[PDB]
Amino acid sequence: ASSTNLKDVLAALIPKEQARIKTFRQQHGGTALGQITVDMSYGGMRGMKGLVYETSVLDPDEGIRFRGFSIPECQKLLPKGGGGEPLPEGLFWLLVTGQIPTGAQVSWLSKEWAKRAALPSHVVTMLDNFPTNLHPMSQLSAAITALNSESNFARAYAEGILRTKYWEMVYESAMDLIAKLPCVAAKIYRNLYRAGSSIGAIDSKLDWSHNFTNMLGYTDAQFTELMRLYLTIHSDHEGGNVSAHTSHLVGSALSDPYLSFAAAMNGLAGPLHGLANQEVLGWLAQLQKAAGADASLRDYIWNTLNSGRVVPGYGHAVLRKTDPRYTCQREFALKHLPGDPMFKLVAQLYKIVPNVLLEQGAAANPWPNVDAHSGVLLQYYGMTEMNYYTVLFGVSRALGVLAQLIWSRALGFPLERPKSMSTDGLIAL
Amino acid sequence: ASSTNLKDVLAALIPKEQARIKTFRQQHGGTALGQITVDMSYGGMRGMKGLVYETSVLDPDEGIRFRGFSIPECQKLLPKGGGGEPLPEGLFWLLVTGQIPTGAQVSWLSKEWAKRAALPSHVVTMLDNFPTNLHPMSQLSAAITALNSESNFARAYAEGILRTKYWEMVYESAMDLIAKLPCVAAKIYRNLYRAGSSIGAIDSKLDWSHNFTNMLGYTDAQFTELMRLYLTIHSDHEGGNVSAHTSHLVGSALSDPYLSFAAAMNGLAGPLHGLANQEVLGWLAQLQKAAGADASLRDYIWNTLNSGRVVPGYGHAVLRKTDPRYTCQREFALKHLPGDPMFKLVAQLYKIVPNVLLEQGAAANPWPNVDAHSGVLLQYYGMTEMNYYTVLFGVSRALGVLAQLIWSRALGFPLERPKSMSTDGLIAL
Numbered sequence: 010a011s012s013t014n015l016k017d018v019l020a021a022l023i024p025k026e027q028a029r030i031k032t033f034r035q036q037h038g039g040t041a042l043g044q045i046t047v048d049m050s051y052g053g054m055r056g057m058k059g060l061v062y063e064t065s066v067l068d069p070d071e072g073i074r075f076r077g078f079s080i081p082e083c084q085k086l087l088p089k090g091g092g093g094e095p096l097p098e099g100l101f102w103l104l105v106t107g108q109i110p111t112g113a114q115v116s117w118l119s120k121e122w123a124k125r126a127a128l129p130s131h132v133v134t135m136l137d138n139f140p141t142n143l144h145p146m147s148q149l150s151a152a153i154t155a156l157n158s159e160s161n162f163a164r165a166y167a168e169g170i171l172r173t174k175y176w177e178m179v180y181e182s183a184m185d186l187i188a189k190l191p192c193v194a195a196k197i198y199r200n201l202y203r204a205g206s207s208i209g210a211i212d213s214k215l216d217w218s219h220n221f222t223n224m225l226g227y228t229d230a231q232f233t234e235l236m237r238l239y240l241t242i243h244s245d246h247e248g249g250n251v252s253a254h255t256s257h258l259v260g261s262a263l264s265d266p267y268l269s270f271a272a273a274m275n276g277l278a279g280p281l282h283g284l285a286n287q288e289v290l291g292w293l294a295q296l297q298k299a300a301g302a303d304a305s306l307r308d309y310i311w312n313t314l315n316s317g318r319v320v321p322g323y324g325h326a327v328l329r330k331t332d333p334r335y336t337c338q339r340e341f342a343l344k345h346l347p348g349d350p351m352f353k354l355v356a357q358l359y360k361i362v363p364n365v366l367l368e369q370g371a372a373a374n375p376w377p378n379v380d381a382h383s384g385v386l387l388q389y390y391g392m393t394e395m396n397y398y399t400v401l402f403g404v405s406r407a408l409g410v411l412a413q414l415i416w417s418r419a420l421g422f423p424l425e426r427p428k429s430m431s432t433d434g435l436i437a438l
Numbered sequence: 439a440s441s442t443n444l445k446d447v448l449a450a451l452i453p454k455e456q457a458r459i460k461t462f463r464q465q466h467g468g469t470a471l472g473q474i475t476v477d478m479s480y481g482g483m484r485g486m487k488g489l490v491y492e493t494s495v496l497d498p499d500e501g502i503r504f505r506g507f508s509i510p511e512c513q514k515l516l517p518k519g520g521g522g523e524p525l526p527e528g529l530f531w532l533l534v535t536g537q538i539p540t541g542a543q544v545s546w547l548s549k550e551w552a553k554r555a556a557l558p559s560h561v562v563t564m565l566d567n568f569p570t571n572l573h574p575m576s577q578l579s580a581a582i583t584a585l586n587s588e589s590n591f592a593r594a595y596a597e598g599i600l601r602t603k604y605w606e607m608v609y610e611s612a613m614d615l616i617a618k619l620p621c622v623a624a625k626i627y628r629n630l631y632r633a634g635s636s637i638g639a640i641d642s643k644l645d646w647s648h649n650f651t652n653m654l655g656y657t658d659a660q661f662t663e664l665m666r667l668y669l670t671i672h673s674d675h676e677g678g679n680v681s682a683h684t685s686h687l688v689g690s691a692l693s694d695p696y697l698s699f700a701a702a703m704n705g706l707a708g709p710l711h712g713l714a715n716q717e718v719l720g721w722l723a724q725l726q727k728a729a730g731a732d733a734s735l736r737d738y739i740w741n742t743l744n745s746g747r748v749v750p751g752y753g754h755a756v757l758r759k760t761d762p763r764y765t766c767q768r769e770f771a772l773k774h775l776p777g778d779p780m781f782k783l784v785a786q787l788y789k790i791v792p793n794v795l796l797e798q799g800a801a802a803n804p805w806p807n808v809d810a811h812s813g814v815l816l817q818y819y820g821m822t823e824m825n826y827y828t829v830l831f832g833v834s835r836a837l838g839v840l841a842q843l844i845w846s847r848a849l850g851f852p853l854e855r856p857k858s859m860s861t862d863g864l865i866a867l
């Protein structure tokens with residue numbers, strides 16, 4: 010009988026996984042995984058194997074994987090609009106379930122996400138009264154924290170549900186959240202950049218990306234394609250990155266998914282993290298302000314380094330090679346905007362930056378990360394409001410942290426609560 | 439020459455500490471601190487020595503310490519109003535500097551915090567338009583995220599300051615934040631519980647606690663005393679607790695102190711964490727609803743356990759004994775409200791709960807934690823709005839996470855970014 014239902018699929022999947030994690034632990038719970046050194050402690054857990062996160066695993070050389078699926082692989086296997094880029098909808102099914110979805114499954118997340126899109130009056134209100142000097146990420150985060158009055162897990166909890174059923178409310182929570190995100194995001198864009206206009210409504214027949222672009226006001230067909238790849242590739246990046254790990258950390262205290270995602274964005278918003286999106290553009294904007302020589306480009310990079318700032322869009326805590334997210338973007342540019350000056354500028358830096366970083370001898374990974382290439386793609390299409398870029402990153406990331414949130418709760422993952430130490434204490438240990 | 443200035447003290451303190459952490463590492467950076475097992479990974483880092491945090495160290499048996507200062511010790515050594523409880527101001531000086539302040543230093547944080555108290559118009563606005571079904575923690579968090587437009591570190595960063603000077607803007611950031619907190623908190627209270635009234639203004643001559651109580655509208659002299667202990671003992675609890683660790687985690691990406699503190703509250707807001715404050719009261723409220731026998735009390739506890747819920751206010755991830763925060767509160771009650779029925783009820787549970795928890799055989803620590811005792815103290819004084827309790831916890835916690843934030847940045851602590859793994863991956867490792 011019947012038809013598509015992530016939830017019913019999930020219901021078959023949880024017990025097996027549980028069981029499977031049970032014996033594993035019964036047999037290796039005591040196996041040492043690694044060691045912890047002083048340096049790791051002082052170094053922000055660098056190199057520490059500390060979290061279990063399932064939806065994605067990052068390889069230091071090869072880069073991110075969604076099952077064991079690489080970006081190029083997803084590109085090939087996930088369903089497309091009709092027509093080149095992969096639907097973030099399909100990634101999502103993939104992240105939750107471990108399996109490649111059928112277009113028919115994919116069409117289901119679309120409707121579903123379309124059905125759930127709705128904003129409460131208080132939230133709209135707040136967004137409309139916010140000042141234009143309030144950063145876009147700030148507005149996004151305060152808005153999602155403010156949606157928690159709508160929480161199905163928050164409500165269920167207060168009613169006293171048995172802990173075995175958490176995963177069920179979380180899932181509603183997450184589907185509703187994802188569903189709402191674009192409305193919230195577009196409302197910010199519109200208030201800040203298209204004053205007096207309106208987001209309009211969601212069209213049950215479109216895919217999530219395409220309703221987002223409409224609400225953002227973009228008509229360019231290829232722009233929609235950009236959005237679909239963008240939202241897909243920004244999805245997830247294992248659980249130790251600030252944004253994901255934050256969501257995991259807060260979600261672990263039983264704060265609802267709205268509250269964990271909003272904390273997550275306060276993290277995405279850090280310069281060292283997602284804000285790099287925006288930071289690259291400004292730096293590029295500054296560069297061009299002060300078609301240059303490789304050498305003048307180089308004087309430029311040293312000046313940043315010498316000033317005790319970072320070069321944005323370069324380096325990575327885990328990656329040891331060029332981010333396949335960066336390559337992916339590059340290949341998109343070569344097909345669609347190969348003659349763009351900004352693009353050409355990004356291709357040029359690629360030949361200098363890492364060399365300069367190797368020169369300085371401090372960065373462990375001198376290659377570009379995803380942030381180095383995303384904004385140029387956007388700017389080309391007419392979306393030149395750079396302080397807004399990170400919101401896009403936010404909307405995508407929801408796909409991964411929320412898919413995992415549902416698993417944490419399904420698996421009964423407990424309170425994230427490590428032991429801390431002081432310098433005196435350590436010195437004495 | 440001259441007079442009091444935390445900042446000038448801090449300026450003398452940073453280089454020494456830096457230097458001191460330099461050689462330490464040069465000599466032990468490679469020393470293994472511990473090991474990581476599968477179980478620890480699956481278990482939310484339980485038992486993992488993973489963070490360096492300086493302001494406070496929690497001993498599993500003896501409980502929290504601010505330098506190496508115990509709660510009873512602070513009680514004795516910190517300056518008081520004039521007249522029994524310790525000023526959260528003095529704790530703060532203590533947390534930042536490692537030293538016991540003089541009343542004259544303490545009077546300085548008071549004025550300082552009084553000088554900096556001010557709310558921007560947009561923030562006030564948002565608070566006034568929020569719905570009454572929007573949880574108090576929600577409102578607090580969206581409000582602090584929304585204050586980030588005022589960030590001195592956010593502004594400085596965008597201007598390109600050298601990384602050596604971060605600690606300086608953070609400190610302004612933190613002093614301004616602490617300073618504002620009570621205004622924000624009281625404005626929420628007032629809107630939600632005293633509609634039509636106003637917070638009134640801050641009096642440069644009072645201490646931080648006493649201006650808070652006034653803005654909250656409480657006149658009881660002993661209530662002020664309660665507040666002063668409360669805000670002091672809730673200050674900090676090492677860095678691995680959700681709230682603190684969150685702030686550390688987000689702050690590590692360079693998000694300003696407003697954004698890190700607001701993420702921190704999304705964490706405090708979890709039932710498993712600070713919300714326990716509130717959870718205890720409701721549970722107590724439910725209990726009394728359905729002067730009882732030890733036995734009926736016991737049937738009551740089993741019913742919670744059997745229902746797959748937690749008993750609130752009991753248990754702890756690190757503590758192995760009764761929280762000295764709990765004892766501290768208990769001793770306050772015995773002096774001031776020994777005949778209170780709710781209090782008597784809390785004393786009774788103390789004789790049953792742990793026994794029942796020992797019975798069940800799942801909790802590692804069956805003793806009460808701070809959350810088990812705080813609300814009864816408040817309720818007694820007429821502050822019976824339990825969904826509000828966690829805000830108080832929030833305002834206090836700022837004292838510790840912000841004091842450490844200033845050190846992280848002063849010490850050049852990098853990006854918190856551990857390695858995650860999947861079950862498949864682990865299974866294969």
Ligand SMILES: CC(=O)SCCNC(=O)CCNC(=O)[C@H](O)C(C)(C)COP(=O)(O)OP(=O)(O)OC[C@H]1O[C@@H](n2cnc3c(N)ncnc32)[C@H](O)[C@@H]1OP(=O)(O)O
Nearest residue numbers: 281282283285319320321322323324325326371372373852
């Ligand atoms: C998408 C994500 O948010 S991740 C990347 C987005 N962020 C950026 O593009 C910002 C620039 N990048 C950086 O700040 C870093 O490369 C990070 C945060 C991505 C990685 O951090 P870490 O693991 O601590 O890097 P790494 O181990 O290479 O640091 C060694 C030294 O090189 C420096 N370094 C690394 N990347 C850079 C860079 N892009 N510009 C200048 N110096 C750099 C580090 O700051 C550090 O200096 P320090 O020892 O005085 O603190």
Ligand SMILES: CC(=O)SCCNC(=O)CCNC(=O)[C@H](O)C(C)(C)COP(=O)(O)OP(=O)(O)OC[C@H]1O[C@@H](n2cnc3c(N)ncnc32)[C@H](O)[C@@H]1OP(=O)(O)O
Nearest residue numbers: 423710711712714748749750751752753754755800801802
């Ligand atoms: C102030 C702070 O926020 S910390 C405490 C505030 N929180 C509370 O009072 C909520 C009740 N407490 C709890 O949920 C826990 O005792 C915590 C979160 C404080 C500690 O968490 P953990 O380190 O994971 O606890 P512990 O190791 O004892 O857990 C072992 C088992 O006992 C259970 N247990 C522990 N405390 C309780 C309690 N208060 N009621 C019922 N069962 C409990 C745990 O949930 C777990 O069950 P599980 O294996 O099916 O998941």
